[model samples]
Target: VGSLNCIVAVSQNMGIGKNGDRPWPPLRNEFRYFQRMTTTSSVEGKQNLVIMGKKTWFSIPEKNRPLKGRINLVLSRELKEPPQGAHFLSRSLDDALKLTEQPELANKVDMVWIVGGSSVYKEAMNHPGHLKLFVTRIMQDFESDTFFPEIDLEKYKLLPEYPGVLSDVQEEKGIKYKFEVYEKND
Candidate 1:
């Protein structure tokens, strides 16, 4: 892997693009993917940080939301107040690298995990660091109004998928999938 980072895009749409199709199953997949990705990255129990938009935080499960053992950055154009229990903060997508790489934060954090919706992933891609993508090619076609922005294949190098642990146990009732990690090309 060339780049050294990861982002978990739970949903691509701002409102609910993929919701109609794989709602419950994908939601389950999200947590499983998150745990597996974190473990495989060999970052267990470290002060892992998650950068996200305000909307993403609201959408995540209360018990499972604002993941423990990590930091959460909430991005909002009009959030008047930072949500409680969140490491609430805001910054334009252009300034993410600057904001995330500060000595005070970067020095204490092990990995910067970007967990999100459409806009967050869009911003994450531009940074060209590293991205851990848990892609599920659904059986049924989804006509998504909002979707992940195109990523430059040339900018990302694919890392091997974590083997067998990814089979049936984690697959949703009707979905089949595997996790893939990508690092930005140097």
Candidate 2:
């Protein structure tokens, strides 16, 4: 079994992306929070797995590719080999999920983080391994063609506070945002 976590920055309308990039302006603190969560692992000498689509992988700047300390896994069908800075290449979500079960990776990987595009997020949410969702709620809406999938709140309950997370709302450059974590009920 695998411990799956999802991280996303969504607008008030659940908008996640626009035109292959972030629709709204950058939230420096929010980005830092994402970096922290994905990179940090409780297991000594172990790293977390970051699973993202090819587009999502490319969206990150070259300087930050590989995302430091974490194993980058890119989901793609066209790519025969792992992209530069990517440690693994998966043809499907199932392929990525299987990595968590391998004896070699299973012990070394502490957590599996779903860093998105809509399709990957949707699949991860339905995956039996999914455990928690880390969302940065943008208090305002922006023009976006890509949207976050509807979450089943009945199955995942939002926490008032979570460890290692800032519960209070934060503002940057006049825009307000808040970090939220939802864990599966069972």
Candidate 3:
């Protein structure tokens, strides 16, 4: 909320999860796997926030729902006061970013994560910002009801790739993921 600079999103969603909850298994595990990479402790002091629609908020587990240490912002045209643990509430993504400017209320946070329920990611991509996407190329492909909105490959030209081993869960799916940094043309 404070520094309020970069926006990271899981841009390519084949199966969208409702209420911050990733899709149901066997797809849900993929979300969890992705979450860990996004929340790495390397940037602890730099504020990292996740802004989502109401449905994503409902989907997160009680403990995991209110991502500790980072700001949890709920973006809704409907809800006013957010669930107990939310750090902030805004009518829209712009409003959420505005909250980062107010002197006393400014978030001083550096990174913003757009964990989604679909349209949220679409909106985030429309606004220009840097993104660190954790893309998991899983082996088993299944039809999905929910999907991450389409992102422009031209806008998000790959900057670098840090290849890595898959998490324990990925072994089963023959999935391999990497931390890739994408920078939108200035």
Candidate 4:
């Protein structure tokens, strides 16, 4: 009923994380954009779903785990129950997606935002649904072990501009970056 949005930040080399943590310092405004974009839901009183892998869950600061105003869905086969601040726990991306379709939640969730840590990106990216990629491209390069998954432009198109999103590049802490939105062109 709604699009699956992938919200992530990538370095020039497409690196997303290193040693299970963010590679760069917290570029205040850039990080805030993630919060702004994900927490926004067109439907009043409805919250979006931020689906993430176990490692990604840990990467976030302890106090920010549940990410205010949105539903946290952690995907982990090793986890026996939902992590402390998580709203739900599922074994796989497929299993997690099913949770949104449940009658009780179908009307409650506005969108499903895929926050990956590698393992969950493949399936989530390839899932047959209305997929939207919201990537924050960081111009500076950083040493990272995990990288964002390669996108298939054949299946998606980069938007020149998107509503409620700044189209021009922004600079912070001498780091230049821009918000990119990719929607399924097909």
lDDT of each: 0.56, 0.88, 0.58, 0.86
Between which residue pairs do clashes occur in model 1?
none
* Candidate 4: tens digits of C-alpha lDDT, residues 1-186: 366888888999999999998888788898788888888897887888898988999888998878999989899988999988888999988888788788867889887888887768777777786778888999889999999889988888998889988998899878889999998734
Task: Report the Cα lDDT for residue 136, model 3.
Answer: 49
Where in model 3 is the C-alpha error above 4 Å?
1-13, 18-21, 24-46, 105-107, 163-170, 173-180
* Displacement of the residue 129 alpha carbon in candidate 1, Å: 4.6
Best by lDDT: 2
26-92: candidate 1 lDDT, tens digit per residue? 5465556566554343443456566677766877667866676666767787876668778757766
Where does model 2 exceed 4 Å of error?
A: none
Candidates ranked by TM-score: 4, 2, 3, 1
lDDT of 4 at 46: 87
Point out where model 4 deviates above 4 Å.
none
Can you write out model 2's per-residue Cα lDDT over 1-186, one digit (the tens) per residue? 336889999999999988788988888888988999998887787899999999898889899998899989999899999998899998998988777788858878887899998999888888774479998999998889999999899899999899999888899989899889998835
C-alpha RMSD of each candidate structure in angstroms = 4.4, 1.5, 4.3, 1.3
Which model is ahead, 3 or 4, in terms of TM-score? 4
RMSD of 3: 4.3
